[PDB]
Amino acid sequence: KQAFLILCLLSAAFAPICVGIVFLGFTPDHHCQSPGVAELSQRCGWSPAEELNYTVPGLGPAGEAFLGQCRRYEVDWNQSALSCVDPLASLATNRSHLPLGPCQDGWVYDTPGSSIVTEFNLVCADSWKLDLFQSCLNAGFLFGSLGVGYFADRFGRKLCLLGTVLVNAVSGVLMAFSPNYMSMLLFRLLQGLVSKGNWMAGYTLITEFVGSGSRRTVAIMYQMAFTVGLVALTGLAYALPHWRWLQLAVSLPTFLFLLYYPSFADLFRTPRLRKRTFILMYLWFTDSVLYQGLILHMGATSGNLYLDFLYSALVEIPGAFIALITIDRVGRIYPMAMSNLLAGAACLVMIFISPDLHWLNIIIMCVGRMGITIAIQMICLVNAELYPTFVRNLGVMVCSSLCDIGGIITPFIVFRLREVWQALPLILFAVLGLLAAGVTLLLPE
Numbered sequence: 003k004q005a006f007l008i009l010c011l012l013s014a015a016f017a018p019i020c021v022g023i024v025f026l027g028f029t030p031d032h033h034c035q036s037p038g039v040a041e042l043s044q045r046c047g048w049s050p051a052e053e054l055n056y057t058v059p060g061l062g063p064a065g066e067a068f069l070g071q072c073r074r075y076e077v078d079w080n081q082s083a084l085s086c087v088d089p090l091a092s093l094a095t096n097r098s099h100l101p102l103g104p105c106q107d108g109w110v111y112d113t114p115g116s117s118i119v120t121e122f123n124l125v126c127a128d129s130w131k132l133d134l135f136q137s138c139l140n141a142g143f144l145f146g147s148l149g150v151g152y153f154a155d156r157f158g159r160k161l162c163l164l165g166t167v168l169v170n171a172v173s174g175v176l177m178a179f180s181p182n183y184m185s186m187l188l189f190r191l192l193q194g195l196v197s198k199g200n201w202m203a204g205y206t207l208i209t210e211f212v213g214s215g216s217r218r219t220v221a222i223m224y225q226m227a228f229t230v231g232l233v234a235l236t237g238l239a240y241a242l243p244h245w246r247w248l249q250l251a252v253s254l255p256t257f258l259f260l261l262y263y264p265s266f267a268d269l270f271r272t273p274r275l276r277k278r279t280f281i282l283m284y285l286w287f288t289d290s291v292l293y294q295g296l297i298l299h300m301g302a303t304s305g306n307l308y309l310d311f312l313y314s315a316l317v318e319i320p321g322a323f324i325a326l327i328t329i330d331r332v333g334r335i336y337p338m339a340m341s342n343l344l345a346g347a348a349c350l351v352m353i354f355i356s357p358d359l360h361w362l363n364i365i366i367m368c369v370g371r372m373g374i375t376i377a378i379q380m381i382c383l384v385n386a387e388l389y390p391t392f393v394r395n396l397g398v399m400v401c402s403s404l405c406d407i408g409g410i411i412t413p414f415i416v417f418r419l420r421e422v423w424q425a426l427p428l429i430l431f432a433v434l435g436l437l438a439a440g441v442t443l444l445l446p447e
């Protein structure tokens with residue numbers, strides 16, 4: 003009870019770290035700031051959207067909003083010769099011919115809140131530095147998954163866990179006060195180092211305290227605690243429009259936990275075990291890539307982010323309960339295959355739905371998120387029981403590191419590859435899911 007409560011709290015408090023980029027690092031509509039614009043808007047009395055129409059460059063042919071977002075007319079707005087009705091009509095017959103410069107004078111963001119993007123100006127040529135935030139976090143996970151085993155091998159368990167909790171709490175708080183991007187990424191990285199160590203430690207403790215007659219149940223509980231964490235994060239992000247306030251409020255939960263007081267070659271030597279390991283690695287990679295992929299996509303494209311994220315998080319609960327039934331009554335291999343086929347098909351269909359059908363797109367997104375949630379429940383158990391107890395620890399640690407490599411790769415896909423073609427990420431997610439579906443059928447039941 004008491005211990006189950008602090009471990010579930012630690013799980014719920016992990017979820018804001020993993021997915022916080024969706025709310026701490028949203029990108030609003032933006033355009034080059036300039037002198038004289040506000041003064042001409044006062045003199046003529048422009049309304050906001052009207053001011054945007056007269057001032058900001060046009061979106062251009064069938065797309066190319068980049069030239070509105072990252073460029074401006076090289077025009078002297080201070081000139082009283084400009085017309086109140088339309089200043090650009092005083093200068094060129096076609097608005098395309100005017101000289102375009104970059105946003106050297108800074109940017110204007112349409113939001114009452116703030117995000118790391120809006121604070122550090124992670125837009126245009128800098129825009130990759132946003133995804134680098136999630137890259138640094140997943141690199142933290144990757145290094146920590148190696149370092150924690152050596153630390154726990156050479157330092158006492160209870161002290162190890164208390165240390166990693168303290169480090170996570172303090173680095174999380176300090177990130178809220180970080181004065182520049184590089185310092186922020188160093189706190190992010192350090193938190194990435196300790197976050198997954200804390201999570202897996204709590205999971206180990208809770209699955210040790212509860213016997214196998216209830217272990218599976220308590221594990222699914224622990225997971226639903228992560229879902230509750232996503233819901234709490236959604237409420238906090240709704241109530242707290244500023245990222246710095248959100249980053250404090252996210253970190254203080256951890257202070258309650260404080261206030262409370264072999265042969266790696268073995269995975270590959272045998273060709274059967276080698277093939278099985280490669281499959282399990284692929285499934286882990288694909289599910290991690292799909293889960294972070296869809297969460298980041300949603301955060302990057304959804305128009306009603308708080309509601310879409312709430313619905314999608316709530317949908318994880320039915321998926322967990324369905325898994326809890328299915329593992330016992332039906333099996334694992336065909337369930338995890340159909341759940342990956344369902345996620346892949348959902349990603350495929352999301353390519354063809356016109357974005358105005360948001361009421362349908364959210365349903366397809368929910369079906370996909372349920373599918374991958376079931377897959378994530380199934381894969382943990384299959385990855386565990388397919389390895390003998392002697393090998394289990396090494397195999398889980400290694401395969402769950404491919405999760406983190408996928409988490410390092412995914413941000414560049416979702417935030418950079420999408421710029422080539424908006425559908426492309428969903429094409430990749432479709433291919434990855436459908437292949438993980440097919441490959442799943444090769445595992446023994």
Ligand SMILES: C[C@@H](Cc1ccc(O)cc1)NC[C@@H](O)c1cc(O)cc(O)c1
Nearest residue numbers: 020198225228229290293378382402405
């Ligand atoms: C990296 C991973 C750690 C991990 C390790 C071993 C394991 O069996 C399951 C998970 N946590 C984040 C994410 O992948 C995730 C999200 C979620 O909503 C539920 C999850 O279970 C996992």
